[PDB]
Amino acid sequence: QMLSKNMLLGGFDTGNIKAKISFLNEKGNIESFAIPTVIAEAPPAKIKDEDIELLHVRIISNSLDGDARSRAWYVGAYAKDQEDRQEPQKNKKLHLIPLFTSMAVAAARIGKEEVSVPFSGGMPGEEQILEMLYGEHTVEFLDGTYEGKKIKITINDGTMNVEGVSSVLAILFDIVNGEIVEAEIGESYAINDLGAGTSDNAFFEDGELNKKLSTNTDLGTNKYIDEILKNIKERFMPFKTREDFIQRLVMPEVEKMIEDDTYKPTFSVKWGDVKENVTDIVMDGMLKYAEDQKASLMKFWFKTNADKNIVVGGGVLFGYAGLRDLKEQDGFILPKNIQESAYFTSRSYLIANLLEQLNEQMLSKNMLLGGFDTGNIKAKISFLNEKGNIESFAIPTVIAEAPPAKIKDEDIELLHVRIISNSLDGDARSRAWYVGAYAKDQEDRQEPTVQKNKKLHLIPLFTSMAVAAARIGKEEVSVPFSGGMEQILEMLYGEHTVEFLDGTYEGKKIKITINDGTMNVEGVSSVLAILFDIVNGEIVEVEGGESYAINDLGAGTSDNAFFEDGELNLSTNTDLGTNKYIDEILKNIKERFMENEIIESPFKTREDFIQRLVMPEVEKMIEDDTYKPTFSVKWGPVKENVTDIVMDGMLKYAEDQKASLDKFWDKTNADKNIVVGGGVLFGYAGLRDLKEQDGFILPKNIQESAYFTSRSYLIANLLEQLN
Numbered sequence: 060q061m062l063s064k065n066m067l068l069g070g071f072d073t074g075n076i077k078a079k080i081s082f083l084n085e086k087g088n089i090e091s092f093a094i095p096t097v098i099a100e101a102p103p104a105k106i107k108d109e110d111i112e113l114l115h116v117r118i119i120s121n122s123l124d125g126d127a128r129s130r131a132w133y134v135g136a137y138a139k140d141q142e143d144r145q146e147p148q149k150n151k152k153l154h155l156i157p158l159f160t161s162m163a164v165a166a167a168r169i170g171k172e173e174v175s176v177p178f179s180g181g182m183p184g185e186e187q188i189l190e191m192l193y194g195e196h197t198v199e200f201l202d203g204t205y206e207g208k209k210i211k212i213t214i215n216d217g218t219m220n221v222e223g224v225s226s227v228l229a230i231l232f233d234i235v236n237g238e239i240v241e242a243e244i245g246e247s248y249a250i251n252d253l254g255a256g257t258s259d260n261a262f263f264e265d266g267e268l269n270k271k272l273s274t275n276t277d278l279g280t281n282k283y284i285d286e287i288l289k290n291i292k293e294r295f296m297p298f299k300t301r302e303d304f305i306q307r308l309v310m311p312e313v314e315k316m317i318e319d320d321t322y323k324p325t326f327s328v329k330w331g332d333v334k335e336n337v338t339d340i341v342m343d344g345m346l347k348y349a350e351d352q353k354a355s356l357m358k359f360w361f362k363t364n365a366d367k368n369i370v371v372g373g374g375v376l377f378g379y380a381g382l383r384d385l386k387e388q389d390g391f392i393l394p395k396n397i398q399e400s401a402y403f404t405s406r407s408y409l410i411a412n413l414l415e416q417l418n419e420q421m422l423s424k425n426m427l428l429g430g431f432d433t434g435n436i437k438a439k440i441s442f443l444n445e446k447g448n449i450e451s452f453a454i455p456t457v458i459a460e461a462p463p464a465k466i467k468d469e470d471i472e473l474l475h476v477r478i479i480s481n482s483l484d485g486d487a488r489s490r491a492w493y494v495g496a497y498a499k500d501q502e503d504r505q506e507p508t509v510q511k512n513k514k515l516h517l518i519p520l521f522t523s524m525a526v527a528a529a530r531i532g533k534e535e536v537s538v539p540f541s542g543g544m545e546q547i548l549e550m551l552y553g554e555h556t557v558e559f560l561d562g563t564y565e566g567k568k569i570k571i572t573i574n575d576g577t578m579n580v581e582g583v584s585s586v587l588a589i590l591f592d593i594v595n596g597e598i599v600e601v602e603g604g605e606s607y608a609i610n611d612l613g614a615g616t617s618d619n620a621f622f623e624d625g626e627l628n629l630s631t632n633t634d635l636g637t638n639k640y641i642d643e644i645l646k647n648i649k650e651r652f653m654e655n656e657i658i659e660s661p662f663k664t665r666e667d668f669i670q671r672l673v674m675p676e677v678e679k680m681i682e683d684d685t686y687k688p689t690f691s692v693k694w695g696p697v698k699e700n701v702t703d704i705v706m707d708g709m710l711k712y713a714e715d716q717k718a719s720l721d722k723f724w725d726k727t728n729a730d731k732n733i734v735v736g737g738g739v740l741f742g743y744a745g746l747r748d749l750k751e752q753d754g755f756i757l758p759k760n761i762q763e764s765a766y767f768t769s770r771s772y773l774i775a776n777l778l779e780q781l782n
């Protein structure tokens with residue numbers, strides 16, 4: 060139960076204008092207050108929310124400049140009324156002092172002069188930060204409610220809760236004595252802390268933060284407050300601080316609107332002796348701020364295509380007159396312990412704080428048998444697992460420089476590895492990388508450019524072998540390499556390590572030995588996947604010459620090969636890839652979405668359009684040839700049926716390939732055209748119908764049509780080992 064034991068559990072949101080803090084006091088619930096980031100030099104002796112009203116403290120901190128080392132300061136809303144004020148390394152003293160004060164004030168509320176604070180802040184490295192706060196500090200009150208009290212604060216460890224996970228806790232949980240549940244959100248959502256200086260827009264798909272679309276803007280309440288105050292003065296033809304104007308004139312009226320939905324607000328301010336009714340001068344600024352945010356919020360909604368939009372902060376309370384319109388539109392979630400909206404961030408850090416504080420055959424029992432189709436976009440690999448059949452996946456040929464330390468078919472959707480190969484060069488020879496779709500969501504990405512390069516191809520290949528080895532539960536495998544059309548495939552013999560710094564194989568170190576190799580240069584093995592399959596053992600495929608042609612339909616190009624007597628001949632490749640067809644489908648879908656209400660695109664990348672929208676329907680179509688597909692796209696709040704646009708692009712692609720296919724059959728006159736690659740699955744809607752006329756053969760299993768090239772290389776590898 061109770062960790063105290065002298066522990067102050069708190070969440071701390073330090074910004075440029077206020078220092079918000081949420082802490083467990085004596086009772087077990089949550090208390091919260093804010094100290095403006097303001098400090099003013101003070102004489103060494105004296106000269107509800109009563110505490111922050113007057114903060115005159117002397118701080119003896121070893122995290123301090125020495126200069127402010129042990130000297131007196133005015134802190135907070137009291138420092139505001141000084142003219143040696145300081146307002147936002149340089150100068151850090153401005154942040155650390157009002158923070159230590161809040162801890163002292165918090166500790167004093169629970170009646171302790173020595174408290175140990177596991178620091179749970181947030182960044183608006185990161186052991187880099189906590190070492191700035193570590194050690195023990197003393198805060199002596201020279202005045203105020205705790206006049207003469209000396210609070211001693213020891214900071215041990217902590218979390219910076221930049222992890223993103225913690226930023227959404229205050230909407231799912233609450234602390235009342237014992238921890239409560241308020242999951243009704245989606246797996247993807249936007250969080251918008253509406254601040255006084257800045258509007259912070261964050262987006263979270265899956266579990267955590269998508270910092271490609273995440274932004275910080277200058278849409279704060281200050282500018283609007285500043286103009287309201289100005290016009291008030293122009294009507295008197297004051298309030299000294301912005302905050303003063305909020306707590307006195309504004310904060311009352313807002314809550315009456317909260318206590319009661321039909322309440323008419325009334326802003327009147329007396330100056331000196333005169334009472335002027337400024338009920339509309341305030342309302343305009345309030346409603347105008349409201350408008351700009353809904354504009355801003357909706358733009359970010361279409362940008363992220365989030366399923367839920369959470370709106371928190373004090374900007375909600377300030378613009379509540381116009382922002383209460385959001386309770387009616389779904390996609391938008393206020394937390395409706397709504398007075399607590401301002402401290403939503405600090406509450407989140409408090410909950411998270413609390414949480415961590417709670418603490419024939421073959422035999423192959425160390426050989427990795429794989430066929431490798433390493434390309435310009437995907438590093439496709441087909442390998443044998445324990446059970447003895449073929450598993451296949453593809454790793455996006457994209458890498459990104461990574462920190463050497465931590466900070467189905469989805470063990471590869473967190474690939475953080477270090478590659479130690481003799482085949483690497485630069486200082487890549489000894490450094491960590493983000494591999495696969497994750498140098499996608501990183502701006503230090505490197506992607507193939509039309510050499511070195513080279514590291515760009517070797518790393519996803521070695522990682523693919525890793526994932527394979529780690530999958531069959533071996534902490535290292537001998538790999539007979541089977542690639543495809545003098546080498547420097549001995550970049551690749553010798554031996555290679557890959558160590559998982561994260562992901563499903565956290566801490567697993569996978570070290571790879573390559574000693575043999577074949578290129579399957581002849582084309583005869585490039586077609587092996589349609590005559591054979593490996594199910595536990597090796598079998599001939601259910602229903603199958605002198606010569607045959609092959610059409611691999613890729614993303615970038617459609618390649619044509621011709622084999623006679625099995626042997627490779629007349630081979631060409633057209634840039635008749637799926638990419639331009641997909642791009643103009645996406646182009647068309649987006650433009651059917653451009654009316655009545657509609658910032659970029661509903662789908663994040665080309666892969667996103669396929670993995671989510673397309674290949675589900677294709678699977679229903681493969682399993683059932685009478686099934687009508689239904690392609691529907693949701694973008695923000697808009698749900699439109701784009702079945703036409705997707706089917707049209709598929710069918711045009713189907714004909715264009717058929718047009719190209721028939722031509723290549725004419726010049727080579729092969730007995731058999733085999734159509735393979737991923738383009739088969741994309742244009743399957745029309746290629747399943749045109750298959751019966753032109754007279755060519757598609758492979759079954761057809762779901763694995765993409766890995767056909769890598770599959771054939773695997774069989775050639777297996778056949779090889781059988782001598």
Ligand SMILES: Nc1ncnc2c1ncn2[C@@H]1O[C@H](COP(=O)(O)OP(=O)(O)O)[C@@H](O)[C@H]1O
Pocket residue numbers: 074075076077079253254255256280281301302305306309310311313314372373374376377398401
């Ligand atoms: N209950 C309330 N009624 C009216 N205005 C409020 C209320 N609570 C906070 N505000 C004001 O809303 C504005 C939003 O600022 P805030 O969200 O506190 O910024 P920060 O991100 O620094 O915490 C502030 O100027 C604050 O004074």
Ligand SMILES: Nc1ncnc2c1ncn2[C@@H]1O[C@H](COP(=O)(O)OP(=O)(O)O)[C@@H](O)[C@H]1O
Pocket residue numbers: 434435436437439612613614615616637638666669673674677736737738739740741762765
């Ligand atoms: N299961 C699937 N359903 C529909 N389309 C797919 C499927 N798998 C892959 N594709 C698409 O087929 C295209 C070709 O993929 P692939 O042949 O692997 O490209 P490359 O060989 O050039 O790397 C890709 O654009 C991809 O989006």
Ligand SMILES: [Mg+2]
Pocket residue numbers: 072074252253254372404
């Ligand atoms: Mg804030």
Ligand SMILES: [Mg+2]
Pocket residue numbers: 611612613614736737765768
């Ligand atoms: Mg391909």
